[PDB]
Design a protein around this motif. Structure first.
Motif, PDB file in Angstrom:
ATOM      1  N   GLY A 128      51.647  69.651  26.895  1.00 44.85           N
ATOM      2  CA  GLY A 128      51.078  68.764  26.205  1.00 44.85           C
ATOM      3  C   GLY A 128      49.631  68.120  26.229  1.00 44.85           C
ATOM      4  N   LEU A 131      47.473  62.206  26.155  1.00 45.30           N
ATOM      5  CA  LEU A 131      48.476  60.752  24.493  1.00 45.30           C
ATOM      6  C   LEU A 131      47.306  59.989  25.407  1.00 45.30           C
ATOM      7  CD1 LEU A 131      50.662  61.174  23.092  1.00 45.30           C
ATOM      8  CD2 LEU A 131      51.774  60.607  25.220  1.00 45.30           C
ATOM      9  N   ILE A 239      54.619  65.371  28.598  1.00 42.88           N
ATOM     10  CA  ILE A 239      55.662  64.826  28.552  1.00 42.88           C
ATOM     11  C   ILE A 239      56.540  63.870  29.137  1.00 42.88           C
ATOM     12  CG2 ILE A 239      55.100  66.958  26.345  1.00 42.88           C
ATOM     13  CD1 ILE A 239      57.932  67.833  27.837  1.00 42.88           C
ATOM     14  N   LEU A 242      57.577  60.181  27.295  1.00 41.95           N
ATOM     15  CA  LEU A 242      58.111  60.328  25.775  1.00 41.95           C
ATOM     16  C   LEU A 242      59.030  60.027  26.238  1.00 41.95           C
ATOM     17  CD1 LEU A 242      56.793  64.071  23.940  1.00 41.95           C
ATOM     18  CD2 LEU A 242      55.219  61.974  24.171  1.00 41.95           C
ATOM     19  N   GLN A 252      55.698  59.312  18.101  1.00 40.47           N
ATOM     20  CA  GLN A 252      55.267  59.654  18.540  1.00 40.47           C
ATOM     21  C   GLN A 252      55.441  61.391  19.823  1.00 40.47           C
ATOM     22  OE1 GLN A 252      54.556  56.975  22.295  1.00 40.47           O
ATOM     23  NE2 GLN A 252      54.571  58.641  23.700  1.00 40.47           N
ATOM     24  N   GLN A 256      53.177  64.935  20.047  1.00 42.56           N
ATOM     25  CA  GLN A 256      53.250  65.717  21.529  1.00 42.56           C
ATOM     26  C   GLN A 256      54.206  66.101  22.008  1.00 42.56           C
ATOM     27  OE1 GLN A 256      51.207  65.177  25.489  1.00 42.56           O
ATOM     28  NE2 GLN A 256      51.006  64.351  23.531  1.00 42.56           N
ATOM     29  N   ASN A 259      51.930  69.426  20.362  1.00 39.16           N
ATOM     30  CA  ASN A 259      51.356  70.166  21.445  1.00 39.16           C
ATOM     31  C   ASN A 259      51.502  70.550  22.523  1.00 39.16           C
ATOM     32  OD1 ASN A 259      49.449  66.146  20.650  1.00 39.16           O
ATOM     33  ND2 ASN A 259      49.143  68.697  19.990  1.00 39.16           N
TER      34      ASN A 259
END
Length: 296
Positions: A128, A131, A239, A242, A252, A256, A259
Motif C-alpha cells: 500500500g 501513509l 496496511i 489500518l 483512512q 489505503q 493504494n
C-alpha cells in the motif's frame, strides 16, 4: 570429415541447449504465474477489508458493531500476511520482498536470458506504500483514575463534547469508554480512536492536529490532558496499522486499501509482461529447434 563432425557437434550443442532453454522458459513462466495468482488472492482479501470499511463508516454503527467488523479485518490482514510470506516457487519466496530479480536461461549460450523483475513486498507492513497522518497513543494502564466519573464537558475533541462517562471499575474499561465516546462523534471531529486490546493501547488518528480540551484536564481520567495541538505527524508504510474502529479509521482504510490494490495491479502488469516475453521466446525456441532438427 573433421569439419562435418564439428558441425554436427555444434548442431547437437544447439539442439540440446535450445531444448533445455524451452524447459527453462516453462519454469520461468510457471514462477511468474505463481506470483500473479497469489497476488490475486491478496486482492480478494483486500476487497473484503475495503467492503467492511465502507460498512464501518456508516453513522448507525455502535462501537460494538465496529469492533466486530475490526475482528474480521484483523483475520483478513493475517491471511494477506500469510500469502505474502508463504508464496513460493521451488523453495524461492516470491512476495515477501526478497525476490529482487532473477535471470532465466532461455538460449543455448551464456548471457541469453530473460529476467523476472523485482516483485514488491506484499507483506502487510509494506503493501500500500506510504501513509501520512496525525496519531496519539496512550497505554490503557495510564488511566489510573478510571474510577473518576466524567461529566459532560470534561473532555472535548475539536470543540465537540464527548459527553458523560460513568466511573469505571478498571483502566481497561475506561479505555473502552473513551474509545466509544470519542468515536460517537468521529464523523463530526475527524478524529478516530482505536483500542487494541492485545497491545493495551488506545490510538487517536486524524488528518491534522487534535484539539483536546474540557474541564477534566487529566490524562489519568480522560486519556489525554488539554492540548490544542495533540498528536505527532506520523508516516508509516503498509496496511497493518489500518483499522475500522472509527469513522476516521474506516475512511483512512478505504483509501489505503485502494493504494494496496493499485500496488497489486502494477506488480501483476510487470509479471504479465514477462509472461508474454517467455511465451514469445518459447515460440521462437520451438521454431529454431524444429529447423535445426531438419538439418540433421
Amino acid at each position: 570429415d573433421a569439419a562435418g563432425l564439428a558441425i554436427s557437434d555444434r548442431m547437437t550443442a544447439q539442439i540440446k541447449g535450445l531444448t533445455q532453454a524451452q524447459r527453462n522458459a516453462n519454469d520461468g513462466i510457471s514462477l511468474a504465474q505463481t506470483a500473479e495468482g497469489a497476488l490475486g488472492e491478496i486482492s480478494n482479501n483486500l476487497q473484503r477489508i475495503r467492503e467492511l470499511a465502507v460498512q464501518a463508516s456508516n453513522g448507525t454503527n455502535t462501537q460494538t458493531d465496529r469492533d466486530a467488523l475490526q475482528a474480521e479485518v484483523t483475520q483478513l490482514q493475517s491471511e494477506i500476511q500469510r500469502v505474502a510470506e508463504q508464496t513460493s516457487f521451488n523453495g524461492q519466496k516470491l512476495l515477501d520482498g526478497s525476490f529482487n530479480g532473477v535471470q532465466f536461461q532461455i538460449g543455448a549460450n551464456a548471457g541469453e536470458t530473460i529476467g523476472v523483475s523485482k516483485i514488491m513486498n506484499a507483506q502487510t507492513a509494506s503493501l500500500g506504500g506510504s501513509l501520512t497522518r496525525t496519531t496519539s497513543t496512550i497505554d490503557a494502564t495510564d488511566l489510573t483514575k478510571y474510577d473518576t466519573a466524567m461529566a459532560a464537558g470534561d473532555l472535548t475533541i475539536n470543540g465537540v463534547d464527548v459527553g458523560k462517562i460513568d466511573a469505571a471499575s478498571t483502566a481497561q474499561e475506561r479505555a473502552a469508554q473513551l474509545t466509544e465516546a470519542i468515536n460517537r462523534v468521529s464523523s463530526q471531529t475527524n478524529v478516530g480512536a482505536s483500542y487494541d486490546k492485545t497491545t493495551g493501547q488506545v490510538t487517536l488518528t486524524s488528518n491534522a492536529a487534535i484539539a483536546v480540551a474540557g474541564a477534566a484536564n487529566d490524562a489519568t481520567v480522560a486519556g489525554w490532558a488539554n492540548n490544542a495541538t495533540t498528536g505527532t505527524a506520523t508516516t508509516t508504510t503498509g496496511i497493518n496499522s489500518l483499522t475500522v474502529s472509527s469513522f476516521t479509521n474506516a475512511q483512512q482504510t478505504i483509501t489505503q486499501i485502494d493504494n494496496a490494490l493499485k500496488d497489486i495491479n502494477t506488480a501483476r502488469a510487470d509479471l504479465g509482461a514477462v509472461q508474454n516475453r517467455f511465451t514469445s521466446t518459447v515460440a521462437n525456441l520451438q521454431s529454431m529447434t524444429e529447423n535445426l532438427s531438419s538439418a540433421l
